[PDB]
RNA sequence: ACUAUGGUUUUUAUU
RNA sequence: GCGAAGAACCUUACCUGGUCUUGACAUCCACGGAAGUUUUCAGAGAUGAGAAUGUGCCUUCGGGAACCGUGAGACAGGUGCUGCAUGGCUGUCGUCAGCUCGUGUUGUGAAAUGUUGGGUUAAGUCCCGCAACGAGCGCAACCCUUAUCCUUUGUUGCCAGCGGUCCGGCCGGGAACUCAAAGGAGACUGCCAGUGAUAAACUGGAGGAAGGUGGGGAUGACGUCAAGUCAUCAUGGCCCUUACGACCAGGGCUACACACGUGCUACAAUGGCGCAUACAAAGAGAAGCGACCUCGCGAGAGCAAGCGGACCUCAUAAAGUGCGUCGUAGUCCGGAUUGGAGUCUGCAACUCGACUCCAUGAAGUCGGAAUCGCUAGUAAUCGUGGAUCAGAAUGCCACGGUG
């Protein structure tokens, strides 16, 4: 897990509040480029491209012990091998092998 | 699909052809990227685009049939 | 080295009562679907009426007796030694081989429906003039290479 | 051998566990971040309470814990029916109100963790250690048990040689499934060399 | 009308929790005697045996998820307090609803 | 019913 | 289809140029500002320079501090080089029957005995024999699971028996039969007849739903080899640190001079096409699944009920069954080309996006050499879910129909 990718994940939460909240109603009216074919708000059209890293692109939920996009269960945040460790400790609730 | 059909303008060129009467006569301006399309207002201004290690000089004429800036700038060094 | 069977239960024909007439369907079928083979059996007996059909009240059990596989060669040793000798195929296998020998010839006629193709090849086998035999002619030569065995 | 772990890969059967924590199924992946935040100031308080085993208990948005100690007079004094002096610490380091419990201990020297602490005291000090190993074997085998492993690795010189040794007693099945082997890991660096101490005790099957 | 949500990952622990809330209901007047068990669910999970380069070979783990709602026709001066103060049991999620 | 090859150098016991 | 469930930027190794640094990440010291919000110019941007507004937490206002912006040391960053350093985890045989111990015995000794020898098995399993004997770990047990007959329950699930009947499991009403959550019984080589040191240990027949560890999982001894990996992670030695570091914008792993596994589809009439027509499991969902109803050739859009998920939502499974119709025509079957427009998403559809609608129709008659799977609900075969997911599969993992 990379400290620059962990620090970017925090910056994304604080920018989703900034560029991805209360802008969707404006985005619905500024994104039309055929209804009159006239240019009169170009600065506001280039505002929809201001966010580059804080929108649903790049954002992945990842394995919460390695930062890795692979081999994990999002219902626990644990990998397909650390689930064996935690199930052998009773540390994932009710998850068992035999003993039923 | 695309905007607006056909080749569409970019602000980073639209400004440089409006400043062409304020900055006057000079050696070619760098614009880096090769993605933009050409438009009939690009006449009388010389520009340069990145080739992958340096920049190469480009000029637009009425003898063009519509193009991207990459069609003036090859990036490969064999064939 | 351990089996020893286990012959497995099979369902004989509901209208003719025969195991051999149900066994034919297991070889006539395509992609395990079986239902179209169950529509070609006996439907190929109404077409066979006009031709050399053998025992109509036995459907195909007597017409299959006109198809004559008898011997098998290659993949064998005798006396612990490599030998090119023929062997006689088991009686419970000979007719199940004759079933493939006739449906593999019949479906590869260049004309009409299977119900007609099969009625032609069963009439022409009853005079020994049938199709699709050259594919096994070099095996029949190898079976005739030896009459003195070991 | 030697990597089959009694308190790792063999812990998912017949053994008591040291941690259980409850959370919303849709935020267990978010609460996983807290599992060190509850330890970071408490792990170095366990020896200060003479604790032989901890059981971390965490209800939804809460904390409890149970601790097993032979010497509760070290952390609560007399008479043991008021645990306030420990509760006020556990609730402050956790950032949430807490209700902790204290349990008793039977045959405390018949324990792989005490045997490991009794041997590590020699090697973290670069002194004679085999006396403590033989004393631990003749302590455990005369207090209970049917076999024991006590193993040491590194700085066993002889000046700057490393080496590894154990000398076993009785019988100790480490590959049998339901053997219930009491175990502890110890690992350290003195800033001049690495050391390790490995302990396994066998008492009875199932 | 109100409902008391009981959720568990085991078919015996949900019946122990049902006996624990009925034992408490009989000790706050009357409120629960024999509720309905509802339909059940399962979730199946796989884990890897070797930490690298083998994901074909897996081992299987299971949870059996239960839900009970109890359902109440009239709460009392003891239902809204003494039955809410109940600590119940470990391994079970308890909520009041509506 | 069937055949000859390989120079020289060459790593675990512990952070 | 493997490290690496979906690599346009990002990811990232590699490669160009900007922009920022004792470092965004861990702690400590000198100095300033509330973080933040509002806005203009420079730049595509990372950032740079101006102009206002707030005064939180903390606080007798003291200066502290989350945080923001400049300084300086110990130290940070680096999927940088290397698995002949040092951990950790490791391939495959294989659930395979093997690997070992103490005290005696034997040889000059390394070594041997037992564990070999003789029958038997899935078996170091059990009898026989015995200067070697009894033991340990692995095994077998243990644990999970299935057809049948019972048993608990009795629901919005089921309807034998009985009452009524929009003539229906529908409604009465019922726990019969399925069934849902679970617990039992049955099988003992018992019985017949064979086999064999008539031993140990096996094999047919009868009955039974099923029999000779009933089957199948889940159980991983001794281990094999300078075993794999500096690319999950740890980390010495060595290097970069006004950066090879993080951040931006360009690109590269599809440039094409030379080229290949693995896997799939047609080669028919047992079809191709338009209708009629029969039967599912596994599951899955609140900034969610999204209905009713209209519109859009369609992908979708308007829109927002019901359900916190057995009286709501995803979702009419296809192969199969039967008419009509073309016809042995390189095929009225089959599939490369080819030219544009729609739908969804995204800095971005230059370029190797997906979904959607057309016209042209090269190749193809089961394919040289060499060669793979499976003993039965197995092999083969046609569809449907689940996971990944801003937009992106026929792959990965499951399940049903036929067999």
From Swiss-Prot, chain A:
GO cellular component terms attached to this protein's record: cytoplasm; cytosolic small ribosomal subunit; small ribosomal subunit
Keyword Calcium: no
A GO MF term: structural constituent of ribosome
GO annotation (BP), single: cytoplasmic translation
Entry keyword set: Ribonucleoprotein, Ribosomal protein
Pfam families: Ribosomal_S14
NCBIfam families for the chain: PRK08881.1 (NF006477)
PANTHER family registered for this protein in UniProt: 30S RIBOSOMAL PROTEIN S14, SMALL RIBOSOMAL SUBUNIT PROTEIN US14M
Function according to Swiss-Prot or TrEMBL: Binds 16S rRNA, required for the assembly of 30S particles and may also be responsible for determining the conformation of the 16S rRNA at the A site.
UniProt family annotation: Belongs to the universal ribosomal protein uS14 family.
Self-association state and partner proteins as the record states: Part of the 30S ribosomal subunit. Contacts proteins S3 and S10.
Name under which the protein is recorded: Small ribosomal subunit protein uS14
Organism: Escherichia coli (strain K12)
Curated annotation (Swiss-Prot), chain B:
Keyword Metal-binding: no
Keyword rRNA-binding in record: yes
InterPro entries: Ribosomal_uS19, Ribosomal_uS19_bac-type, Ribosomal_uS19_CS, Ribosomal_uS19_SF
Pfam family, any one: Ribosomal_S19
A GO term from the CC aspect: cytosol
GO term, biological process aspect, one: cytoplasmic translation
Annotated PROSITE patterns: RIBOSOMAL_S19 (PS00323)
GO molecular function, one term: structural constituent of ribosome
Alphabetical UniProt keywords: Ribonucleoprotein, Ribosomal protein, RNA-binding, rRNA-binding, tRNA-binding
Entry function: In the E.coli 70S ribosome in the initiation state it has been modeled to contact the 23S rRNA of the 50S subunit forming part of bridge B1a; this bridge is broken in the model with bound EF-G. The 23S rRNA contact site in bridge B1a is modeled to differ in different ribosomal states, contacting alternately S13 or S19. In the 3.5 angstroms resolved ribosome structures the contacts between L5, S13 and S19 bridge B1b are different, confirming the dynamic nature of this interaction. Bridge B1a is not visible in the crystallized ribosomes due to 23S rRNA disorder. Protein S19 forms a complex with S13 that binds strongly to the 16S ribosomal RNA. Contacts the A site tRNA.
Family: Belongs to the universal ribosomal protein uS19 family.
Assembly, per entry: Part of the 30S ribosomal subunit. Binds S13 and L5 and cross-links to the A site tRNA.
This protein's name: Small ribosomal subunit protein uS19
Protein's organism: Escherichia coli (strain K12)
Gene that this polypeptide is encoded by: rpsS
UniProtKB/Swiss-Prot annotation, chain C:
GO MF annotation terms: mRNA binding; rRNA binding; structural constituent of ribosome; tRNA binding
Keyword Isomerase among record annotations: no
GO biological process, one term: ribosomal small subunit assembly
GO-annotated cellular components: cytoplasm; cytosol; cytosolic small ribosomal subunit; membrane; ribosome
Record's keyword terms, sorted: Ribonucleoprotein, Ribosomal protein, RNA-binding, rRNA-binding, tRNA-binding
Entry's family note: Belongs to the universal ribosomal protein uS7 family.
Quaternary state and interactors: Part of the 30S ribosomal subunit. Contacts proteins S9 and S11. Cross-links to IF3 and the P and E site tRNAs.
Role according to the record: One of the primary rRNA binding proteins, it binds directly to 16S rRNA where it nucleates assembly of the head domain of the 30S subunit. Is located at the subunit interface close to the decoding center, where it has been shown to contact mRNA. Has been shown to contact tRNA in both the P and E sites; it probably blocks exit of the E site tRNA.
Miscellaneous comment in the UniProt entry for this protein: The strain K12 sequence is shown. Has been predicted to contact the N-terminal domain of IF-3 based on footprint studies; exactly how IF-3 interacts with the 30S subunit is controversial.
Name of the protein in question: Small ribosomal subunit protein uS7
Gene name, Swiss-Prot/TrEMBL: rpsG
Residues of the full protein shown: 3 to 152 of 179
Swiss-Prot record, chain D:
Entries under InterPro entries matching the protein: KH_dom (IPR004087), KH_dom-like_a/b (IPR015946), KH_dom_type_2 (IPR004044), KH_sf_prok-type (IPR009019), Ribosomal_S3_C_sf (IPR036419), Ribosomal_uS3_bac-typ (IPR005704), Ribosomal_uS3_C (IPR001351), Ribosomal_uS3_CS (IPR018280)
Keyword Disulfide bond part of the UniProt annotation: no
A GO MF label: structural constituent of ribosome
GO cellular component terms, semicolon-separated: cytoplasm; cytosol; cytosolic small ribosomal subunit
Domain KH type-2 stretches: 38-106
KW Ribosomal protein (keyword) present: yes
Coiled coil, from the record: none
Cysteine disulfide partners in this protein: none
Classification via PROSITE patterns: KH_TYPE_2, RIBOSOMAL_S3
Subunit structure, interactors included: Part of the 30S ribosomal subunit. Forms a tight complex with proteins uS10 and uS14. With proteins uS4 and uS5 encircles the mRNA as it enters the ribosome, which may play a role in mRNA helicase processivity. Some nascent polypeptide chains are able to cross-link to this protein in situ. In collided ribosomes contacts ribosome rescue factor SmrB.
General function of this protein: Binds the lower part of the 30S subunit head. Binds mRNA in the 70S ribosome, positioning it for translation. Plays a role in mRNA unwinding by the ribosome, possibly by forming part of a processivity clamp.
Name used for this protein in its record: Small ribosomal subunit protein uS3
Biological source species: Escherichia coli (strain K12)
Organism classification: Bacteria, Pseudomonadati, Pseudomonadota, Gammaproteobacteria, Enterobacterales
Gene name of this polypeptide: rpsC
